[PDB]
Amino acid sequence: VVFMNASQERTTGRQAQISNITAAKAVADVIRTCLGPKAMLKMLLDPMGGLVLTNDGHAILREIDVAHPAAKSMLELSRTQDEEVGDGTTTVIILAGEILAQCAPYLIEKNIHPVIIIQALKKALTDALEVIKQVSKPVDVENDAAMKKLIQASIGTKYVIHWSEKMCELALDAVKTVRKDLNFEIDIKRYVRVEKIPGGDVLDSRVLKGVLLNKDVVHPKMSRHIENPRVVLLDCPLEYKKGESQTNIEIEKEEDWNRILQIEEEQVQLMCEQILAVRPTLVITEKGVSDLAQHYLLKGGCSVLRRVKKSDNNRIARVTGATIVNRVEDLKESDVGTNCGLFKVEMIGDEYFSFLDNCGLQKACTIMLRGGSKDILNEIDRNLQDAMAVARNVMLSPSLSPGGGATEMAVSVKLAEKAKQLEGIQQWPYQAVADAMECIPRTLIQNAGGDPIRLLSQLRAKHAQGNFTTGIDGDKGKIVDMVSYGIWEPEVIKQQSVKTAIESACLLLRVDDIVSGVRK
Amino acid sequence: SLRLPQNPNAGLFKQGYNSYSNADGQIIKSIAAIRELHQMCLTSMGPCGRNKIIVNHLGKIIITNDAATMLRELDIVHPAVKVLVMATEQQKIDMGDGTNLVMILAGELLNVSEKLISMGLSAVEIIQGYNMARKFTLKELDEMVVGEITDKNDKNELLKMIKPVISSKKYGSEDILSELVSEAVSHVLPVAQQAGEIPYFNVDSIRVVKIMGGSLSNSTVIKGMVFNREPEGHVKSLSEDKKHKVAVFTCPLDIANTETKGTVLLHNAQEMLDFSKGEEKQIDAMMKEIADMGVECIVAGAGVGELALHYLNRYGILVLKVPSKFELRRLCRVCGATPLPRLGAPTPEELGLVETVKTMEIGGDRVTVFKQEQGEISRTSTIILRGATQNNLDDIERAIDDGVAAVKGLMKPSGGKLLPGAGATEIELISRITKYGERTPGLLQLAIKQFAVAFEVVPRTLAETAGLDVNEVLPNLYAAHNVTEPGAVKTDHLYKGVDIDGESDEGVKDIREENIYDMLATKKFAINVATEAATTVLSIDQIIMAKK
Amino acid sequence: SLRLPQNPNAGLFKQGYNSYSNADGQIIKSIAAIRELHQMCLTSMGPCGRNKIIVNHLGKIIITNDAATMLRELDIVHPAVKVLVMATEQQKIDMGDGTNLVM
Amino acid sequence: SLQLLNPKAESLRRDAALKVNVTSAEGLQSVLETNLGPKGTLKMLVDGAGNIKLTKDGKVLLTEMQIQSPTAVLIARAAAAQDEITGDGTTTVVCLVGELLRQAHRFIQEGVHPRIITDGFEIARKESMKFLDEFKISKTNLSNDREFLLQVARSSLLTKVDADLTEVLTPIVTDAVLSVYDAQADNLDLHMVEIMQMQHLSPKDTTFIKGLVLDHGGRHPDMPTRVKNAYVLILNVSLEYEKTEVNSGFFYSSADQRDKLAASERKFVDAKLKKIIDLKNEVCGMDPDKGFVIINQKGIDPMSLDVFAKHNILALRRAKRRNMERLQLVTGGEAQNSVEDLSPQILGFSGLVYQETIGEEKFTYVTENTDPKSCTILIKGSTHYALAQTKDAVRDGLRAVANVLKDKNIIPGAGAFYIALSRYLRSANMNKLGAKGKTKTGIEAFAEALLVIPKTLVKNSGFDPLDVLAMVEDELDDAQDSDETRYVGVDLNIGDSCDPTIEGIWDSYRVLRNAITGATGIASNLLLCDELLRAGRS
Amino acid sequence: SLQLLNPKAESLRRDAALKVNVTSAEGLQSVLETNLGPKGTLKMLVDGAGNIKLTKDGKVLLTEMQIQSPTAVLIARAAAAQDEITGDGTTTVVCLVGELLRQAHRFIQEGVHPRIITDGFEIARKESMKFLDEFKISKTNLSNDREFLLQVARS
Amino acid sequence: NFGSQTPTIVVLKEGTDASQGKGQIISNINACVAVQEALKPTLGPLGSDILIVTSNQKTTISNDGATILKLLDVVHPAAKTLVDISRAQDAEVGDGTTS
Amino acid sequence: EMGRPFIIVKDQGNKKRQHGLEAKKSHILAARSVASIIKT
């Protein structure tokens, strides 16, 4: 009989709660060294063999296979922070892992029901958002000098802090190019193109507005340098089109077979004449190009590029202003790309690269990153995406919040004053969030080599004086305020980190049993 | 990229050797490993504690709630847990009391240490915090002591000592188990008041005989020792009274044999005819001198030949077999006899006195009654224990030994030194150490304040095992200790304690009427061993194991 | 003292790779290895030379004293022999005479 | 705490992973350090198939040998990227990465945190880039002198083969450019030269050709092998149809139409051949010594070979894709797809066209051009590895002479640039610090690590590197007070110093610039990685 | 050339053997690196029989735990014999041997011959003996100072 | 630190059962009721008997609660308590072991 | 079963139990097989 074939034996009670808390703490313990400007790096080995070396929180979690079912929920929390914002994925797990670590001596000790704690976690979440809103100050979103210091917040942890002066100029013009007036700037990462070119120097880089293609020219005579280029996008291949009806031709007369090949040559010449009506200087298609259509376009000087990526065509239409039309009969002068210039093909031994420079507000840009190695170049790509994500929330809302240990401790002080005034059953779980916000500033000291005992003891005494700007230095570990050094981070990063940790803590505390063997 | 370097230069040691250090959360895993066996003993604490079943490899089942006994049959793996296992065994041997307290207290010191380590406190500063707080703890125990046992033996006073100790082990009925143990203690006491002699007591004097069947109410106290034996020649009720004269021989009764090459030598038929009747006259001449002294019973320590048992039945002398040693050693302490190896006539001054020897059916077999009477008092009395199951008979035997060990605590120190029970001892120390933590400047106050937090497990365990909410009951108890002391003396608020079930809401008024108290000599070593047990775990930065 | 350290470089490259370097072997050692096949060609040289029977895995037997033909059908694991084998292959392809002299 | 997540997951934290990065880089360097210099060792790569490859370059060695250690994979991918752009510096980067880790690992055991160690690397590297501008010497490439290009090209060949074959290949790699230049446009492409693999003569008997050489021979016997005047007609259309796009068939009512339907396919073939024959006689008729040659990228109908055989026309089929662009540069013609538009202006010109039969294949030779814009290099060898060993020596020599035209600045070689950085990075004074005692630790580790390059050269020659560099520091001390600028090199012959400018040894600009920057990032990330973790689903 | 002498044998020489003595002594010193000093770590040994050995002495760590590496066997026998006669110096010799191999290993990679390196060790050690006479402080036992024996015992 | 495995220490030796949760004490109740199921039809003068054959092929027919539990070997810890009360009742009074 | 092995008596699966009408039918047929042998 066996009754249930899936986990007929059951683990329930405090045994299931310990397994959920212990596994959740192990997720945050490995990334404790990944927080701070002195943070170390972690290398990951996939079954495919590709090596990924980064200090990012999300990149470490998603590439590690965790056999513990409840600990897998910790792996997907960084995806919520990465997809919505992209910055602060490390602080989410450290905070969420500390909550369950602090909430452990309740069900075992105080015997408090989880829902009773959940009701306290929701009330502490509302008060935490108010403290973050009070400590946040608005700044000018149109100031270019002010946005450069804001991007350096996430760069100070990353290895690109040496190039931070150069990296801020790369990320600033990238977000400003793709944004447009409409939900405000509605910027999207899909419009920003980051191309990875092995070799070169990181100090030498430039923001290029256009699409960088690795495809070579289809014919040697094609001019690789055009003063006034004209781009016309065509989804239809220049090769002879065959009907899907599987038409079978019965040839009887001797002149029927010779005429079929001639008509195939006449239509290819006819399709070129429809293109030459507007006389484009450049031709770009996403499919293959026949050798017959190449000669007919040599007289008009039409440079043809074949097998272009589908998503790249939409990015060409933004910079060049051209309209994608599949049939050659609807081609008009309005559909031809305009305002495009500086078309040149640079000769590099690895691949042939094509450049585009722009002179309907949506635009695009291609950032050329030159690293020392292919794997380091993959790190700068990830560091550039997180750098541009910081400028997104700054342009969405003017609100700007402190960081580096000031915001986390500012909430814990406000939670200590209200805790003594509750005088009820919810007083114990309400104090768990106050001690949970201390892990982030304590981790910054442990990674800096300082003494967390004496620094955090005097740190709480400073916040009682009425100033919320007191942080923790990452290098010297000084108690000096963050206004002097200038650490500031968008409020959305602080909000998404607290909201995710509270919603995740309530999920694992409600699991009283773990069963397997279902095999759906 | 496909395979890791797998820790190069690891061939320095065998593959079975593993290295575990305080770093990488292993010191947290060691504390978490304690909580696995810690919760096992939490449900076993108090009079409402739950006994546990442990099956060994041989199939023997021992059902007990004692932490020291349960950890004996269990196979321990983690090294630091053996520190906690061997710590509870020492408390059971030394004082015979407070075994469950050492198991729980040493486990809670590591639980509160997890928060201390997370804050950055070094292992050196944590050890110094517990050592300075323990010295202040031992000094406050002598200040809070109330009452004394005074006289050695009393009918009422022995109910304030053994009874609260046996209340946690097999609670059941109160006065039934207390009277059985308190009776056997008064017999082994030399008394002799006003003589100024040094009192003496033996924990192995009182013996518990396990006999299945019957009921607990049918148990009694026997002044003599009880064994399962079958008389050889005859059974005698000995109704002729006038007591008896008894002798004990540690050597067997038989013709003395040469230790080397004992052999019968007969040269001629003349020596063969007198060889059969010669051995009969040897035992006759030796046993006649014993019968002339009025000895009606002889205790033997080994096998007795049939030729020797013949003349013993002629004069009506009982025969007793006492195998091994310790069984025969405690027999002479009852009658006050001195064994001698020879088979000759014993010294009249070395003969014992036993008035009656009876053989009756108790558990289905013949047992011999050594019970003494009012006069000619005897020592090392035994307690007949009747029960339906043998599993209950094992722990009650250890429960009586806990009361016997409590009598030993009335000898070495100056007195009994009763302490408030029902967890009131560990609760009062919380408010005193809290004030002590503030009086000490520096960073050492973190470990001192958390040292008093570990004492909160005693009121929470008694409240949780009683079916009461620890959130409602525990804060209501601090209301008596939050009012400190008034402008007038004679403050009885120190008697407040935790109540089991009933009406809850604190209760039992002052425990002075309940008569349940604690021993001061027990709490001294219970805190010291439990502190050193948790200190040893915290003092080990790196743990190395072999073969696994 | 029972087990060797296995060297740290054991994890580097793979266990299937074998290394012969200066002072590590070769150095007139591997030169003594080709002497077995060198003596094979010495007996086949001249008008009195001895032919050699070679049976390929396919079963075809080729009996000749030509070093270029014999070394072609033989499967040789020793790499440095192929340097001498490929040296005799050029003699047969281009000039076609003197293959025994080259080896 | 990792096993709680997965039972099969393993990790090494802090110094456990730190010993891996230092050992794995040292083990990989120890194998490739013997290949640095002209006296370096020669490795023989033998796979399971029996292929033999002799090369001293680390690009081919790391590609054929799969690396199991994850630490050395970063060095392999860094040395691979170094060979892509600069075509050189594979062994150099490998020797620098392992040395930067060992020098920095000595300070880690002293209590120095890896964070400040990475600071000393970036500060000292930026100072080396400023010294690189003052140390380099600009040259004038407008004269196009041979002596300057012979010494630079020879320095790269001395690290591949012996001096006998080097003197033969030195003018070849010097001639690898020649007529290919642009003053204004700056575009320089080395993919126009063709690498031919064939066994002929001896590896030292190879020569340079001033015109394109093809591997396809004459398909018909009557086709003249030697042509004095040939007009190259580029045809990208296939004369023989492989298949018809639209499915069709021939249905004949009577047997008389069978030969007619077969002749129906003869009209389309003759239609393309009609305009080709008229193009030959268009220039001049009955003209001896003037031939006509067609080079086709696609296949040519064997039936049509007799059409050109009567007119003595040479035809070539199955040409490479990169061959079409080279026909415009060499022959001076223009690429044509179909035959619909023809003219004498779009036809190329060649002064000599001949074919040679090597083995069972025939190769086409074209030379004697007026202003050829491209050339080729014929690589001949006596064995299988001779083609791969010489090719790796030429391809590494192509990028060396290209950077001379791309960058007029030339940096002396022979370890003169690495020794000069030693004395400059000892004391930075108050210029760039950023911290007290924190930055100077990483700078000292980076300064002493740059001396591994000159010491490795001496170790391969069998001399004492400490005695060679001892006389180098003594010469630099007296040269500063004598008001004379001297560049001290390393001579591996007599075990003494030398002058790289006089001895003829120089190094490329992009090779040394990308080696210092490339090796810095690899060594920095390994010092910043305290844990090596492996996880995944099998 | 050992494969010709024996069918199955294992050997490592020159750079392969140079990494044997340097690396094996590095892992052994790292075990006793945290041992040295009054604030040093405390180690517990638990064998398969159930016995527990808790001490900071490095001699117990070497005798209870087996060592497969033959390099540390020479160090273990040297560190054990140091505690036999002098009652002290078990962890001291291990730190001296393991470090001196690494300090001299950097110059071995530079091309310096090992013999002339070991020859300098004897020259530097003989100076430590001549300096030891002026470094030591004389104490007269005729004073019978109890405080002097207290401070030495607390070391 | 001696190996990349770094095994996780288990508190109890391998092979030990589990406990707590929900239904652990209930498992002991169903063990005694199942043993009671055999002794219920043996109660009363109209009751039946139980045929038990041990591993030695020794035929024994008993309705007595004490003798039935002696034939079978009970490895269940809580079910052995019914064996003690059956042998204790048979030792003194001798009757009522089934009741 | 709740997921844990339930064994009251050693050699659980080895021993079998018969009850009800099937236990009585097996006993009568066992005597009928012996009877028909003796009746002959």
Side-chain angles (χ1 to χ4, degrees), chain B residues 6-7 10 18-20 61 77 214 388, chain F residues 1-4 7 9-10 80 84 88 92:
Chain B
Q6 63 180 19
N7 191 31
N18 291 336
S19 178
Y20 297 138
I61 295 170
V77 176
Chain F
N1 191 30
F2 294 160
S4 295
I9 296 171
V10 178
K80 291 167 62 181
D84 291 344
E92 183 178 2

PDB file of all heavy atoms in Angstrom, chain B residues 6-7 10 18-20 61 77 214 388, chain F residues 1-4 7 9-10 80 84 88 92:
ATOM      1  N   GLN B   6      40.699  20.463  -5.219  1.00  0.00           N
ATOM      2  CA  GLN B   6      40.379  19.591  -4.081  1.00  0.00           C
ATOM      3  C   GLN B   6      41.410  19.723  -2.958  1.00  0.00           C
ATOM      4  O   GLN B   6      41.984  18.742  -2.480  1.00  0.00           O
ATOM      5  CB  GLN B   6      40.189  18.126  -4.517  1.00  0.00           C
ATOM      6  CG  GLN B   6      41.388  17.390  -5.119  1.00  0.00           C
ATOM      7  CD  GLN B   6      41.061  15.961  -5.508  1.00  0.00           C
ATOM      8  OE1 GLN B   6      39.895  15.598  -5.663  1.00  0.00           O
ATOM      9  NE2 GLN B   6      42.093  15.142  -5.673  1.00  0.00           N
ATOM     10  N   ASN B   7      41.615  20.968  -2.515  1.00  0.00           N
ATOM     11  CA  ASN B   7      42.469  21.283  -1.375  1.00  0.00           C
ATOM     12  C   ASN B   7      43.863  20.694  -1.546  1.00  0.00           C
ATOM     13  O   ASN B   7      44.178  19.660  -0.946  1.00  0.00           O
ATOM     14  CB  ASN B   7      41.843  20.785  -0.071  1.00  0.00           C
ATOM     15  CG  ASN B   7      42.552  21.326   1.158  1.00  0.00           C
ATOM     16  OD1 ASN B   7      43.091  22.432   1.141  1.00  0.00           O
ATOM     17  ND2 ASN B   7      42.560  20.543   2.230  1.00  0.00           N
ATOM     18  N   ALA B  10      46.832  18.480   0.836  1.00  0.00           N
ATOM     19  CA  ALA B  10      46.056  17.895   1.921  1.00  0.00           C
ATOM     20  C   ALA B  10      46.549  16.511   2.318  1.00  0.00           C
ATOM     21  O   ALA B  10      46.055  15.955   3.304  1.00  0.00           O
ATOM     22  CB  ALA B  10      44.576  17.815   1.542  1.00  0.00           C
ATOM     23  N   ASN B  18      39.761  15.426   9.737  1.00  0.00           N
ATOM     24  CA  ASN B  18      39.047  16.624   9.327  1.00  0.00           C
ATOM     25  C   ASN B  18      39.368  17.759  10.289  1.00  0.00           C
ATOM     26  O   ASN B  18      39.567  17.540  11.487  1.00  0.00           O
ATOM     27  CB  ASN B  18      37.531  16.388   9.279  1.00  0.00           C
ATOM     28  CG  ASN B  18      37.120  15.462   8.152  1.00  0.00           C
ATOM     29  OD1 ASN B  18      37.831  15.325   7.156  1.00  0.00           O
ATOM     30  ND2 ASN B  18      35.969  14.818   8.304  1.00  0.00           N
ATOM     31  N   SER B  19      39.415  18.976   9.752  1.00  0.00           N
ATOM     32  CA  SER B  19      39.745  20.167  10.525  1.00  0.00           C
ATOM     33  C   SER B  19      38.531  21.082  10.572  1.00  0.00           C
ATOM     34  O   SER B  19      38.014  21.487   9.525  1.00  0.00           O
ATOM     35  CB  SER B  19      40.946  20.899   9.925  1.00  0.00           C
ATOM     36  OG  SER B  19      41.242  22.077  10.655  1.00  0.00           O
ATOM     37  N   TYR B  20      38.085  21.407  11.783  1.00  0.00           N
ATOM     38  CA  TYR B  20      36.962  22.310  12.000  1.00  0.00           C
ATOM     39  C   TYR B  20      37.407  23.416  12.942  1.00  0.00           C
ATOM     40  O   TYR B  20      37.923  23.138  14.027  1.00  0.00           O
ATOM     41  CB  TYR B  20      35.758  21.564  12.581  1.00  0.00           C
ATOM     42  CG  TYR B  20      35.192  20.505  11.663  1.00  0.00           C
ATOM     43  CD1 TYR B  20      34.808  19.265  12.157  1.00  0.00           C
ATOM     44  CD2 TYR B  20      35.052  20.740  10.302  1.00  0.00           C
ATOM     45  CE1 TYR B  20      34.295  18.292  11.321  1.00  0.00           C
ATOM     46  CE2 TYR B  20      34.538  19.773   9.459  1.00  0.00           C
ATOM     47  CZ  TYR B  20      34.161  18.552   9.975  1.00  0.00           C
ATOM     48  OH  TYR B  20      33.650  17.584   9.143  1.00  0.00           O
ATOM     49  N   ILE B  61      16.376  -1.638  27.782  1.00  0.00           N
ATOM     50  CA  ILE B  61      15.630  -0.385  27.741  1.00  0.00           C
ATOM     51  C   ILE B  61      15.652   0.226  29.134  1.00  0.00           C
ATOM     52  O   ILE B  61      15.247  -0.417  30.111  1.00  0.00           O
ATOM     53  CB  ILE B  61      14.189  -0.600  27.257  1.00  0.00           C
ATOM     54  CG1 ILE B  61      14.181  -1.086  25.806  1.00  0.00           C
ATOM     55  CG2 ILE B  61      13.384   0.684  27.395  1.00  0.00           C
ATOM     56  CD1 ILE B  61      12.824  -1.546  25.328  1.00  0.00           C
ATOM     57  N   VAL B  77      28.745  11.754  18.844  1.00  0.00           N
ATOM     58  CA  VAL B  77      29.667  11.970  17.731  1.00  0.00           C
ATOM     59  C   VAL B  77      30.431  13.281  17.894  1.00  0.00           C
ATOM     60  O   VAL B  77      31.661  13.286  17.980  1.00  0.00           O
ATOM     61  CB  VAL B  77      28.925  11.920  16.376  1.00  0.00           C
ATOM     62  CG1 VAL B  77      29.879  12.250  15.237  1.00  0.00           C
ATOM     63  CG2 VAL B  77      28.287  10.555  16.169  1.00  0.00           C
ATOM     64  N   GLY B 214       2.538  -6.714  42.465  1.00  0.00           N
ATOM     65  CA  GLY B 214       2.015  -5.923  43.560  1.00  0.00           C
ATOM     66  C   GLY B 214       1.750  -4.482  43.154  1.00  0.00           C
ATOM     67  O   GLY B 214       1.454  -4.175  41.998  1.00  0.00           O
ATOM     68  N   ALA B 388       4.608  -2.951  38.842  1.00  0.00           N
ATOM     69  CA  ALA B 388       4.048  -3.780  37.782  1.00  0.00           C
ATOM     70  C   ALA B 388       5.038  -3.980  36.641  1.00  0.00           C
ATOM     71  O   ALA B 388       5.149  -5.086  36.100  1.00  0.00           O
ATOM     72  CB  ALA B 388       2.751  -3.162  37.261  1.00  0.00           C
TER      73      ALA B 388
ATOM     74  N   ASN F   1      39.307  21.986   7.178  1.00  0.00           N
ATOM     75  CA  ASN F   1      40.406  22.622   6.461  1.00  0.00           C
ATOM     76  C   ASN F   1      41.346  21.579   5.867  1.00  0.00           C
ATOM     77  O   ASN F   1      42.097  21.864   4.935  1.00  0.00           O
ATOM     78  CB  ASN F   1      41.177  23.565   7.388  1.00  0.00           C
ATOM     79  CG  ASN F   1      42.158  24.446   6.639  1.00  0.00           C
ATOM     80  OD1 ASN F   1      41.939  24.791   5.479  1.00  0.00           O
ATOM     81  ND2 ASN F   1      43.246  24.817   7.304  1.00  0.00           N
ATOM     82  N   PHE F   2      41.298  20.362   6.414  1.00  0.00           N
ATOM     83  CA  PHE F   2      42.125  19.269   5.918  1.00  0.00           C
ATOM     84  C   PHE F   2      41.626  18.693   4.601  1.00  0.00           C
ATOM     85  O   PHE F   2      42.325  17.868   4.001  1.00  0.00           O
ATOM     86  CB  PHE F   2      42.210  18.153   6.963  1.00  0.00           C
ATOM     87  CG  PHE F   2      42.933  18.547   8.220  1.00  0.00           C
ATOM     88  CD1 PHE F   2      42.741  17.840   9.395  1.00  0.00           C
ATOM     89  CD2 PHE F   2      43.804  19.625   8.229  1.00  0.00           C
ATOM     90  CE1 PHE F   2      43.402  18.199  10.555  1.00  0.00           C
ATOM     91  CE2 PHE F   2      44.470  19.989   9.384  1.00  0.00           C
ATOM     92  CZ  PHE F   2      44.268  19.274  10.549  1.00  0.00           C
ATOM     93  N   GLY F   3      40.446  19.098   4.138  1.00  0.00           N
ATOM     94  CA  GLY F   3      39.920  18.601   2.882  1.00  0.00           C
ATOM     95  C   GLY F   3      38.808  19.487   2.372  1.00  0.00           C
ATOM     96  O   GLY F   3      38.178  20.228   3.133  1.00  0.00           O
ATOM     97  N   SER F   4      38.575  19.403   1.061  1.00  0.00           N
ATOM     98  CA  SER F   4      37.515  20.188   0.441  1.00  0.00           C
ATOM     99  C   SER F   4      36.128  19.658   0.780  1.00  0.00           C
ATOM    100  O   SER F   4      35.142  20.382   0.601  1.00  0.00           O
ATOM    101  CB  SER F   4      37.699  20.220  -1.078  1.00  0.00           C
ATOM    102  OG  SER F   4      38.892  20.898  -1.432  1.00  0.00           O
ATOM    103  N   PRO F   7      32.971  17.538   5.997  1.00  0.00           N
ATOM    104  CA  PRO F   7      31.680  16.920   6.317  1.00  0.00           C
ATOM    105  C   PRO F   7      30.957  17.651   7.439  1.00  0.00           C
ATOM    106  O   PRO F   7      31.563  18.307   8.289  1.00  0.00           O
ATOM    107  CB  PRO F   7      32.063  15.497   6.742  1.00  0.00           C
ATOM    108  CG  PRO F   7      33.371  15.248   6.065  1.00  0.00           C
ATOM    109  CD  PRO F   7      34.079  16.573   6.111  1.00  0.00           C
ATOM    110  N   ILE F   9      28.917  17.563  10.818  1.00  0.00           N
ATOM    111  CA  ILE F   9      28.847  16.679  11.975  1.00  0.00           C
ATOM    112  C   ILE F   9      27.391  16.412  12.328  1.00  0.00           C
ATOM    113  O   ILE F   9      26.589  17.342  12.481  1.00  0.00           O
ATOM    114  CB  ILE F   9      29.601  17.288  13.167  1.00  0.00           C
ATOM    115  CG1 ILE F   9      31.091  17.417  12.854  1.00  0.00           C
ATOM    116  CG2 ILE F   9      29.399  16.437  14.407  1.00  0.00           C
ATOM    117  CD1 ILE F   9      31.858  18.204  13.893  1.00  0.00           C
ATOM    118  N   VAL F  10      27.043  15.135  12.464  1.00  0.00           N
ATOM    119  CA  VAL F  10      25.715  14.717  12.894  1.00  0.00           C
ATOM    120  C   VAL F  10      25.768  14.422  14.385  1.00  0.00           C
ATOM    121  O   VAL F  10      26.717  13.793  14.872  1.00  0.00           O
ATOM    122  CB  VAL F  10      25.228  13.493  12.095  1.00  0.00           C
ATOM    123  CG1 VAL F  10      23.859  13.044  12.582  1.00  0.00           C
ATOM    124  CG2 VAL F  10      25.193  13.811  10.608  1.00  0.00           C
ATOM    125  N   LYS F  80       6.399  -3.569  25.163  1.00  0.00           N
ATOM    126  CA  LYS F  80       6.923  -4.468  26.184  1.00  0.00           C
ATOM    127  C   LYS F  80       6.374  -4.168  27.571  1.00  0.00           C
ATOM    128  O   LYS F  80       6.518  -5.005  28.468  1.00  0.00           O
ATOM    129  CB  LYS F  80       8.452  -4.406  26.212  1.00  0.00           C
ATOM    130  CG  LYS F  80       9.121  -4.996  24.980  1.00  0.00           C
ATOM    131  CD  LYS F  80      10.595  -4.632  24.923  1.00  0.00           C
ATOM    132  CE  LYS F  80      11.349  -5.199  26.114  1.00  0.00           C
ATOM    133  NZ  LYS F  80      12.792  -4.834  26.085  1.00  0.00           N
ATOM    134  N   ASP F  84       5.341  -6.854  30.861  1.00  0.00           N
ATOM    135  CA  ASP F  84       5.725  -6.812  32.268  1.00  0.00           C
ATOM    136  C   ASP F  84       4.511  -6.942  33.179  1.00  0.00           C
ATOM    137  O   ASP F  84       4.550  -7.681  34.170  1.00  0.00           O
ATOM    138  CB  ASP F  84       6.482  -5.518  32.564  1.00  0.00           C
ATOM    139  CG  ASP F  84       7.847  -5.478  31.907  1.00  0.00           C
ATOM    140  OD1 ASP F  84       8.336  -6.547  31.485  1.00  0.00           O
ATOM    141  OD2 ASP F  84       8.430  -4.378  31.810  1.00  0.00           O
ATOM    142  N   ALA F  88       3.821  -9.876  35.792  1.00  0.00           N
ATOM    143  CA  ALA F  88       3.689  -9.490  37.192  1.00  0.00           C
ATOM    144  C   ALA F  88       2.352  -9.943  37.765  1.00  0.00           C
ATOM    145  O   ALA F  88       2.274 -10.346  38.931  1.00  0.00           O
ATOM    146  CB  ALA F  88       3.852  -7.977  37.339  1.00  0.00           C
ATOM    147  N   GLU F  92       2.037 -13.175  41.080  1.00  0.00           N
ATOM    148  CA  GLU F  92       1.412 -13.081  42.405  1.00  0.00           C
ATOM    149  C   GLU F  92       0.056 -13.779  42.422  1.00  0.00           C
ATOM    150  O   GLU F  92      -0.091 -14.858  43.005  1.00  0.00           O
ATOM    151  CB  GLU F  92       1.287 -11.614  42.823  1.00  0.00           C
ATOM    152  CG  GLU F  92       0.708 -11.412  44.214  1.00  0.00           C
ATOM    153  CD  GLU F  92       0.639  -9.951  44.609  1.00  0.00           C
ATOM    154  OE1 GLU F  92       1.011  -9.092  43.783  1.00  0.00           O
ATOM    155  OE2 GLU F  92       0.213  -9.662  45.747  1.00  0.00           O
TER     156      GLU F  92
END
